[PDB]
């Protein structure tokens, strides 16, 4: 695979808004995120659509593609980071400068709607991109949870590329829709004990592929959707969905023969899942959809819309040990 240069303290991070104009609509949280990374020693370059609104988006399709491309053209930038997701990153894909991405590999990081770009860029270039922090939701998060997010971010991207990396398990997590865009918290978020579950036995090692499942529907079937192959580990997460939507998305994967191919599934913790009173969790729905197909599942990986968030390279080998209840990166993912 194509590998970007590793991150280092003091590096320059460029940020872009490929969908929702949250540098305006969540400006307080944006400013907190900016200050957080600056105090860590990072220099920041603001994408050209920062501070702009086109109602539901930051700008036209072409303007958003231009914003991203301009960061790729900047030789000082080591990391290109999403400000926030939304709905509309998939629009940009025909207009990204893939040749420039190949010529100037950088750490591309974000999540949620930005999946369209992360997966699309991988499909076109083979570049290992990252499911991880977006500036506003991730680094604008109030303490204590932001520190755990940052610890993973800095560890994954700066560590020496020798031997496997085994993920730490966040001690506590939350998904509460409070403390979004103000100077002070209303009150502390509920801190849940980590209820991540490993369904299965032994160890499964394979290339990880996926991201935000709902977002994948926007690139599905196209040349920008990476081919899922036999032995892959499927990584999927969703946010604030009804159980109805979750069944729909799981069945989509089934119809596409994904469950005939994958060796394991990682479900990211689902932010504020709406069970419609059924008290069912996504894993139970997946089990029905699977129709007896035995696939080991890591249910509740902390790489999703919940806080804190871990950083995950996409398109490289992971090993999930279902007996020892851990997950590791086993393939080099930065130069």
197 binds, among ligand 7MD, a second copy, none (CB under 5 to 8 A by kind): none
Cβ 54 to a second copy shortest distance, Å: 8
d(CA 301, CA 282): 13
86 makes contact with ligand 7MD (CB under 6 A): yes
134 makes contact with a second copy (CB under 8 A): no
259-278 residues near ligand 7MD, rule: CB under 6 A: 271
Cβ 1 to ligand 7MD shortest distance, Å: 25
- By Cβ distance, which residue is nearest to ligand 7MD? 85
- Residue number with CB closer to ligand 7MD (180 or 192): 180
d(CA 152, CA 169): 10
Cβ–Cβ under 8 Å, residues 304 and 239: yes
Cβ 232 to a second copy shortest distance, Å: 15
Number of residues that make up the chain: 335
Cβ 96 to a second copy shortest distance, Å: 12
33 makes contact with ligand 7MD (CB under 6 A): no
d(CA 33, CA 181): 11
180 binds, among a second copy, ligand 7MD, none (CB under 5 to 8 A by kind): ligand 7MD
How far is residue 310 from each of residues 13, 18, 294, measured CA to CA in Å?
18, 22, 27
242 makes contact with a second copy (CB under 8 A): yes
How far is residue 196 from each of residues 44, 59, 282, measured CA to CA in Å?
35, 39, 13
Nearest to 237 by CA among 267, 209, 192: 267
218 makes contact with a second copy (CB under 8 A): yes
Cβ 215 to ligand 7MD shortest distance, Å: 4
45-84 residues near a second copy, rule: CB under 8 A: 54-57, 60-61
d(CA 172, CA 185): 18
Nearest to 8 by CA among 59, 60, 79, 73: 79
d(CA 73, CA 326): 38
Which position among 32, 142, 305, 317 is part of the footprint of ligand 7MD (CB under 6 A)? 305
Cβ–Cβ under 8 Å, residues 109 and 310: no
289 makes contact with a second copy (CB under 8 A): yes
112 binds, among ligand 7MD, a second copy, none (CB under 5 to 8 A by kind): ligand 7MD
Produce one character per residue of 197-226: b if its CB has 16 or more CB atoms within 10 Å, e if not.
Answer: ebbbeeebbbbbbbbbbbbbebbeeeebbb
Question: Which one of the spans 3-11, 146-154, 175-183, 286-294 is the region binding a second copy (CB under 8 A)?
Answer: 286-294
The footprint of ligand 7MD on this chain (CB under 6 A) covers a number of residues equal to: 15
Beta strands in 200-269 (DSSP E): 203-212, 233-237, 264-268
65: Cα separation from own chain's centroid:
20
- Residue number with CB closer to ligand 7MD (269 or 317): 269
Pairing of strands 12-16, 77-82: parallel
- Residue number with CB closer to a second copy (223 or 323): 223
Nearest to 271 by CA among 198, 153, 208, 192: 192
Which position among 18, 125, 215, 311 is part of the footprint of ligand 7MD (CB under 6 A)? 215
Residues that bind a second copy (CB under 8 A): 19, 54-57, 60-61, 86-88, 90-91, 93-94, 217-225, 242-245, 247-249, 251-252, 254-257, 275-278, 288-289, 291
Residues that bind ligand 7MD (CB under 6 A): 20, 84-86, 112-113, 137, 177, 180, 212, 214-215, 239, 271, 305
């Amino acid at each position: 695979p194509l590998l970007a240069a590793p991150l280092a303290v003091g590096d320059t991070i460029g940020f872009f808004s490929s969908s929702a104009p949250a540098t305006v609509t969540a400006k307080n949280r944006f400013f907190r995120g900016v200050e957080f990374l600056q105090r860590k020693g990072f220099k920041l370059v603001s994408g050209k659509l920062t501070g702009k609104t086109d109602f539901y988006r930051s700008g036209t399709i072409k303007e958003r593609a231009q914003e991203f491309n301009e960061l790729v053209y900047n030789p000082d930038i080591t990391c290109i980071m999403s400000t926030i997701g939304g709905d509309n990153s998939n629009s940009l894909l025909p207009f990204l400068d893939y040749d420039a991405i190949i010529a100037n590999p950088k750490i591309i990081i974000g999540y949620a709607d930005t999946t369209a770009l992360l997966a699309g860029i991988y499909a076109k270039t083979g570049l290992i991109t990252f499911y991880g922090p977006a500036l506003i939701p991730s680094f604008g998060e109030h303490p204590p949870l932001v520190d755990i997010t940052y610890e993973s971010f800095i560890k994954i991207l700066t560590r020496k590329q020798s031997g496997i990396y085994t993920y730490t398990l966040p001690e506590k997590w939350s998904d509460e829709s409070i403390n979004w865009n103000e100077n002070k918290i209303l009150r502390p978020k509920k801190l849940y004990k980590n209820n991540c579950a490993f369904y299965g036995s032994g160890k499964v090692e394979g290339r990880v592929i996926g991201g935000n499942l709902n977002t994948l529907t926007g690139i599905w079937g196209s040349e920008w959707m990476p081919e899922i192959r036999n032995g892959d580990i499927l990584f999927i997460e969703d946010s604030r969905k009804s159980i109805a939507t979750v069944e729909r998305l799981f069945s989509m994967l089934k119809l596409n023969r994904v469950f005939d191919k994958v060796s394991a599934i990682i479900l990211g913790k689902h932010e504020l899942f709406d069970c419609a009173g059924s008290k069912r969790r996504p894993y139970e729905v997946l089990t029905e959809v699977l129709d007896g197909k035995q696939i080991p599942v890591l249910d509740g990986f902390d790489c999703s819309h919940t806080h804190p968030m871990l950083t995950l390279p996409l398109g490289v080998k992971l090993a999930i040990d279902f007996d020892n209840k851990n997950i590791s990166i086993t393939e080099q993912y930065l130069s």
